[PDB]
């Protein structure tokens, strides 16, 4: 429904708000399991419906689903952070991780992340279309069809620039500004790969479904 959108973009947007409208949330070790996991279901369950997914080589959607896990995950926390959580609960939380034995060097760029891309005040509409254009990169490690991906992410940059001027029309650089937070958001593959190796050489069972996604 909204006008600036032509015909096409407009059932791509609302498959994928339909999608995405469906998303959740509610020892240390189990807790952190726990989170990851409810990521790891939300992400597999709003990637099979994207749009075009299932017309892709099911190596490559593998290789999009893998690629993609902990900079969705990040965004998704971004989003939960900025616009679902009481700050007085962010705090407890901050205070919770960090006596989790996770440390310092993943928790701080953590939580400027989550200010830094909270500063955009970005609309439901739009984490949804940035964490689509996420998830199909054609860039990822073992794509062997890339302009096949291409072709699926283009049309939801088009639609993800349109909804910038729709919702933020005087700021002019905002589409600009969300692409920049894109390079800030994949810094987290080194910091959590960083961040998991000391709990793989202790090693707590990792389950079935975090060693194929993350793997481990
Ligand atoms: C004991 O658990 C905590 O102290 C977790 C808390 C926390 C603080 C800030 C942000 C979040 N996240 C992010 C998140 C990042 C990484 C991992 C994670 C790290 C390591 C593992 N292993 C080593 C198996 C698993 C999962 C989980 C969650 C958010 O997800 C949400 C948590 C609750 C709702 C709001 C944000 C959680």
């Known amino acids: 429904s909204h006008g600036e959108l ?14 995405y409208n469906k998303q959740r949330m509610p020892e240390n070790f189990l ?26 080589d099911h190596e490559d959607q593998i290789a999009l689903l893998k690629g993609s896990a902990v900079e969705a995950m990040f ?13 007085g609960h962010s705090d407890l939380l901050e205070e919770r991780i960090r006596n989790s034995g996770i440390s310092d060097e993943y928790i701080t760029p953590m939580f400027s992340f989550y200010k830094s891309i909270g500063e955009l005040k970005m609309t439901q ?6 964490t689509a254009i996420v998830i199909l990169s054609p860039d990822r490690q073992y794509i062997k069809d890339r302009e096949a991906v291409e072709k699926l992410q283009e049309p939801l940059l088009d639609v993800l620039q349109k909804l910038c001027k729709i919702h933020q029309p005087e700021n002019p650089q905002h589409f600009a500004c969300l692409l920049g937070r894109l390079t800030e958001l994949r810094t987290f593959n080194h910091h959590h790969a960083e961040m998991l190796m000391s709990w793989r050489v202790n090693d707590h069972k990792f389950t079935p479904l975090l060693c194929e996604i993350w793997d481990v």
């Open 6 to 19: 032509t015909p096409d973009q407009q059932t791509l947007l609302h498959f994928i708000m339909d999608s």
């Open 31 to 56: 807790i952190l399991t726990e989170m990851a996991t409810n990521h790891v279901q939300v992400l597999v369950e709003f990637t099979k419906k994207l749009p075009g997914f299932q017309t892709l």
């Open 75 to 87: 965004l998704r926390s971004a989003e939960i952070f900025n616009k679902k959580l009481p700050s």
């Open 125 to 130: 509409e739009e984490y949804a279309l940035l």
